[PDB]
Structures are given as structure tokens and as C-alpha cells.
Nucleic acid binder design. Structure first.
Lengths: 226, 336
RNA sequence: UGUACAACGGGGUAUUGUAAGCGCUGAGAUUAAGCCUUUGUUGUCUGAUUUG
RNA sequence: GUUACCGCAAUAGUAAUUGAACUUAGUACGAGAGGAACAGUUCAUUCGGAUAAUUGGUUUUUGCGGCUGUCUGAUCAGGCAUUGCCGCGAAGCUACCAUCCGCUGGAUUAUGGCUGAACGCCUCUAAGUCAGAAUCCAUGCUAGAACGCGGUGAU
């Protein structure tokens, strides 16, 4: 059940795809085949229907959401909000982000339990994550790297970051999320590891060009297997 | 440029002519093989569409379009054409034994000075115990492989009043010529709307002469031919909220506030189509449907509007409806 | 001898950027001469030439 | 012959043209990295035909404000300053500087053959043959003989 899926042109999968325990959302790129492939592993438990960002292609790094809520920026139309209101349920509350800041998925890196906010942005998304994400809200700069939603990823059983993580930052975040970490790579050293990967409890996804040691890292830390 | 179009000089006709027809079929209903509009106005429409795999798929899109004023048209007479190893040939023109005023006006270049004695022999003589068209029409029944039908507009029902109505013919795609000929025989002294004629997502053609400019060969004023124009909206001239979309749901007359540029409003249906419809404005244009079976994922699609432009485009187009216009203006100088 | 025409005005869009003058006023001037609808007003309605 | 309208089609001209992008696809095959296509799709190259709404320009709208040398008593109003400059501009006219749109079947050559002598073996060929070209011709487009022609309307 280790998922290597090459998105033909783009090596970053999760820029067009985003998932938590409550859904599966993938963009309109290339066909319905990529869309429906998650069934024979996941199933229809977390539904999947294509949706976009105001028509623009990359849906993954747009929004901040996890199993308790979904949170959408200004840049979407009211109509894609209709769509996320049409098939997608109300038990995951989708609430709009009104501010100048577009990219939530390039900021907010969360899972079922722990969330974050970029320390540079002020309190709005911070506590509104208590309204929408409703999970633990706090801040960290990992090496002050831009896009605090870039290098990071989480799960119930751990998280994944890249080897550039310092011991202050490693042990720091390990303590934050209350589960172990393994700093690792994905897709053969994604220059941002966490922008192309998506993850949930038992599943974490990457490309056909992903190397096996990266996948023994990822699975063997989170035990994606059974 | 192309040597396709030679020689250089002007199109001798103000109304163009129809140089093709869809072949025919014997097993169909009797069908009206073509129709001619009046292009009135240019505009721009926003919408979205279903085009799987294209980069515009399920994605809101904006493009300009053309509107064409389309009066529902009235039919008088039929002529069957025999086929001969030279070309076709007519047999006899027939009519409705009552004609409107304007088609009478087609037969006089000077109407006021004339005696209006035109039809009395033909249209009067048919008043009788019958046989008037009997012999000739049954002759069409026997002979005349292909059949065409006289068609002429009502221009008193258009805001541009020249009082004079054009003539044209259109074929019939039915079969077993009896229910062809009888068809229009039933349709003598009748009109035929655009309802049963076309419907949306159908590619057709509308072409005509183009914008006479002047002499420096002579540039323009040719009837060119541009096929593949997808009708976005088949109008209805009695339809309130002319521009009512699958989205907008507000009342707007497709004729803007204060009217079109050089037009009063729209009394009859219309066709909105993408792209360009040749000519200059105020024009009478020709409509020929596909000439063949084009079927493909490209032509089988379905249009979904967002918003139609009712704004008054003289100067910069700004508001839409005078109710909303007067809510945003609020009270002017003397208003309220 | 009419939704005939033509014009004023009723009006409708829109150009225009606050007008002589005691804030008044996104008001003013123009507006088909290649914009529009004209319940009203005023006015016109048949000359010469040839052909069949 | 008159006048009118609706036609016909002798003939003559023709032109839609190049690229990658999904799918097939990391299939197919190879030691390995790669690696296509038929089409089922998508947008572009380009040429030109449309159209000038929209984005830009363009006003003898000489339509409209700031104003400036002087002429106009103040005012106003204009005038010259060769269309008075900043600014605004309908409209007209423009732009791969905007958008649309841009034919479907035959006959063929090399090629591969079927059948079968010539030649008691064969052979695509000698008779006859089945597919097939950015071609030729039709299909579609543009005109329409000013001594090419049909239909009917009036006396």
C-alpha cells in the first residue's frame, strides 16, 4: 500500500492534491484516471470529486484543513465554495479566509491533532484555526525557512521533514506534535519535501520516481503498512 | 494574399446568395434546410462550459460574440426544379393568392408613383372554384426531383423600416415529394417560426457582403463565407428577461438602456453566436446548416451561460438595468 | 394620407468634469450630422423624360 | 421585346497551413536509462478571411474642463497662436496590440499483393485485378458569360 504515483510533468503531487481523514481532493489535471486510483487502496471512505482554486490548477497548497474543519482563502470564487458545499459535507466546516494572504497550504501544516501558523502572520488564521481546524494552535519557524507549510508534514503516528532539521528544531517539533519524527525526503529529494506529499493515518503518497529508501523512511516511521 | 478569391472587384449584390445545400434524405421529416438573419449589434458574454481535457474545463470563461436579429418569416410559394443534363431548371413559381404589402413592394422600384396593379391577374384569378395551382402543382408532383419554397421576411416587424421585404427560397429535406410539396402547400399564406428550425449547440453558417469602405483593387464589400459558428443562445422575441442565463436570474432586456447603437429594441428572436459574422452592421445574412454530419465530441457539447451583456455599450459600458443603475446612482440632481 | 416623411419637444443611453451669477451643482455645454422610442406639436405629400 | 423578381450554372480562381500537450506511458521493448504511433483528445505556429465589442490608438463630435502671449470694457463669450497646449472624450476609423473562423471524398505513382498465363515451375500483369500520396479531380468557397439560359408579375 505504499503509493508511488508520478504526476507526469509535475513532480510535486500534493500541489494539485490535498487530503485528511475527511476527504480526498485532486485537481483537473490530465484525466479521471489519477483521480479514481485512490480507490483500490483507500476506497470511497474519504470521497473524491475534482475541485480547483478559482479555476487555477494547483489546489493543494491553497487551503488549511484537517479532519475537524476545512479553511479556504479569499482567492476562490463563491462557486467553488458551492462545490465544496455541494458534494463535500458540512461536518467538516469550510470557512473562508478573508485577508491578503492567499496560500494557506504553503503556511499551515497540520494533521488530525497538531496544527500550526506562520509566526509572521498575525492572530487571524491563528485562532480561526481554532474555529475551523479546531486543533492545537501554535507557531514555529523551522530554520526561519519561507513557506512554513513547505518542508513540513505530520500524521497521527509522526511527521515528516527533510534532513536540514536541526536538533533544536527536530526534538522541538517532535515534542510539539507528541509523536516521533523522522526527517526524510520524498520523490527523490523534493526540494520542498512536504509540498508534493500528502499524508493521513495509514497512507502517504509520492511519485513513481520516488526512491525506495525514502519510502522505507516514510512507511517505516509511520508504519503505513499493517 | 490568397488567390482563392479572384477576381478583385465588388460583390454585385447587397443580399448575398446561398451556394450550397445539405444533400437531402428521404426518410426525414420535411425540414427547412436553411434560414437567413439580420445581424444587429456586437457584444461580449461570460459563461462556463463542459470541455473534458481542455484547459478551460469547468472553468469560467469570457469571450465576445455577435447577435443577429431574426424575425419569424412568412412563406408564400413553392417552385420545384427539374433536373436536366445542363443544370436544374424551374417549372413554375406559385404563391399564396394573398401577398403581404412588402413583397408587393419588391416588384416596384417606384412604389408611390405606381398603380399597384401587380397581381390582379394572378392573385385574383385564383379566386374561383379551384384548379388554380392544381395542374401546375400536380405537375411538380410528377416531375421536379428537388423542391424549393419561397420565403420572405416581415420588415415592418424590424426597427429599421425600409418597408421592402427580401425574397429567398429554401429547400425541403423531407422525401416522397408529395409530403414535401403538400407541406408548403399547407404552409401557403403562413409563417414559420425558428422553433422547429434550429436548436442550440448546432453549428451553422451566416455570411454576407462586407463593409464597403471606398476606392484607393476595391477593398471589401464582398460576400465571404465563414462556417463553424456555434449558436450559444437561440433567442425568442417574446421572451421576457432576454438575457436570462443559468446563473444571472435577473431581468434584463438584451436591448440595453437607451437602445442599441443605431437600433430600437428587439421584437423577434435572435441568434447569439461566437466570433464574427461578416459584413458591416444592419445586415441581412445567410444561414446554412452544416451541409453534412459533423458529429464529434467538439460539436456535441452543451453551452452553459454565466452572464449576458445588456450594458449600453455606447461610450464605456457601465451599468446594466435601470433599476440597479438607479440604485447605485441614487438620486441625481432633480430626481428624488 | 400613413406607426409616410421631416423637425422641435416630450423622453432614454451616453460624451462631457461642476458651469453666468447669490455651499447653490457628478452640475454644465453637445448629442446623429455614420445613438435610440417618439400618445404631442409644426409642416410636406407629385414635378419633367422615355419605354412597353 | 419592355419592365421586375426569383433562379440556374458554361467557365475561371482556390489555400488552411506548422509545433508541442494530455491519453497510449514510463505500457510496448531492451543490460539498463529510455520509448512510438494509429486514433480519443488540447491548445498553439503561421497565412488569410471575417469582426473592431472588449484592451491601445485615433475626433473638423473639432464635442468638453485647467489654463497661456495678446484681441475683445468687467463678466462672459470666443480669436489668432496653421486643429492653442495638460487633461476627457463618445463616435468614425483602426491592432497577431482584441476576438472568431478557416473544406471531405474520389482517381492515382513507387509499394505490398489477389488471380493467373506467357512459361507443363513461378510470377502484382500480359487480360483482369484489392489498398494507397503534402498530387489530380471531385466536395466545399468566390465570381457569374456585360451577343449563356429557366421560372413567373404587369399592361
Amino acid at each position: 500500500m505504499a503509493t508511488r504515483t508520478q504526476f507526469e510533468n509535475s513532480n510535486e503531487i500534493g500541489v494539485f492534491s490535498k487530503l485528511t481523514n475527511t476527504y480526498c481532493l485532486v485537481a483537473v489535471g490530465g484525466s479521471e484516471n489519477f483521480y479514481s486510483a485512490f480507490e483500490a487502496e483507500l476506497g470511497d471512505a474519504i470521497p473524491i470529486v475534482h475541485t480547483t482554486i478559482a479555476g487555477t490548477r494547483i489546489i493543494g497548497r491553497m487551503t488549511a484543513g484537517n479532519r475537524r474543519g476545512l479553511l479556504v482563502p479569499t482567492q476562490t470564487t463563491d462557486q467553488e465554495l458551492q462545490h465544496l458545499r455541494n458534494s463535500l459535507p458540512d461536518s467538516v466546516k469550510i470557512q473562508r479566509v478573508e485577508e491578503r494572504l492567499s496560500a494557506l497550504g504553503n503556511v499551515i501544516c497540520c494533521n488530525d491533532y497538531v496544527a500550526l501558523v506562520h509566526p509572521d502572520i498575525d492572530r487571524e488564521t491563528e485562532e480561526l484555526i481554532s474555529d475551523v481546524l479546531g486543533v492545537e494552535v501554535f507557531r514555529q519557524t523551522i530554520s526561519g525557512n519561507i513557506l512554513v507549510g513547505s518542508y513540513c508534514s505530520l500524521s497521527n503516528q509522526g511527521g515528516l521533514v527533510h534532513p536540514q532539521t536541526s536538533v533544536q528544531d527536530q526534538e522541538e517539533l517532535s515534542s510539539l506534535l507528541q509523536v516521533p519524527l523522522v526527517a526524510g525526503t520524498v520523490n527523490r529529494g523534493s526540494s520542498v519535501v512536504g509540498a508534493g506529499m500528502v499524508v493521513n493515518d495509514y497512507l502517504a503518497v509520492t511519485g513513481l520516481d520516488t526512491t525506495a529508501p525514502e519510502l522505507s523512511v516514510i512507511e517505516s516511521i509511520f508504519r503505513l503498512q499493517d | 494574399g490568397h488567390l482563392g478569391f479572384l477576381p478583385r472587384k465588388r460583390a454585385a449584390s447587397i443580399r448575398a446568395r446561398v451556394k450550397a445545400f445539405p444533400k437531402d434524405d428521404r426518410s426525414k421529416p420535411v425540414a427547412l434546410t436553411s434560414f437567413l438573419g439580420y445581424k444587429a449589434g456586437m457584444t461580449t458574454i461570460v459563461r462556463d462550459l463542459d470541455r473534458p481535457g481542455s484547459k478551460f474545463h469547468k472553468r469560467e470563461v469570457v469571450e465576445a460574440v455577435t447577435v443577429v436579429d431574426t424575425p419569424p418569416v412568412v412563406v408564400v410559394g413553392v417552385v420545384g426544379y427539374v433536373e436536366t443534363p445542363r443544370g436544374l431548371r424551374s417549372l413554375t413559381t406559385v404563391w399564396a393568392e394573398h401577398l403581404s404589402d412588402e413583397v408587393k413592394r419588391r416588384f416596384y422600384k417606384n412604389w408611390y408613383k405606381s398603380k399597384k396593379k401587380a397581381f390582379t391577374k394572378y392573385s385574383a384569378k385564383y379566386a374561383q372554384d379551384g384548379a388554380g395551382i392544381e395542374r401546375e402543382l400536380a405537375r411538380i408532383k410528377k416531375y421536379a426531383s428537388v423542391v424549393r419554397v419561397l420565403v420572405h421576411t416581415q420588415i415592418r416587424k424590424t426597427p429599421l423600416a425600409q418597408k421592402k421585404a427580401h425574397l429567398a427560397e429554401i429547400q425541403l429535406n423531407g422525401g416522397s415529394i408529395s409530403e414535401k410539396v403538400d407541406w408548403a402547400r399547407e404552409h401557403f399564406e403562413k409563417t414559420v417560426a425558428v422553433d422547429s428550425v434550429f436548436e442550440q449547440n448546432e453549428m451553422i453558417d451566416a455570411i454576407a457582403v462586407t463593409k464597403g469602405h471606398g476606392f484607393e483593387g476595391q477593398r471589401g464589400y464582398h460576400s465571404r463565407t465563414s462556417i463553424n459558428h456555434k449558436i450559444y443562445r437561440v433567442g425568442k422575441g417574446d421572451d421576457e428577461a432576454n438575457g436570462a442565463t443559468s446563473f444571472d436570474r435577473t431581468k434584463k432586456t438584451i436591448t440595453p438602456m437607451g437602445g442599441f447603437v443605431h437600433y430600437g429594441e428587439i421584437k423577434n428572436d435572435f441568434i447569439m453566436v461566437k466570433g464574427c459574422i461578416p459584413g458591416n452592421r444592419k445586415r441581412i445574412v445567410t444561414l446554412r446548416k452544416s451541409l453534412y454530419t459533423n458529429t464529434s465530441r467538439k460539436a456535441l457539447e452543451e453551452v452553459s451561460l454565466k452572464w449576458i451583456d445588456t450594458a449600453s455599450k455606447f461610450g464605456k459600458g457601465r451599468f446594466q438595468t435601470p433599476a440597479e443603475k438607479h440604485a447605485f446612482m441614487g438620486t441625481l440632481k432633480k430626481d428624488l
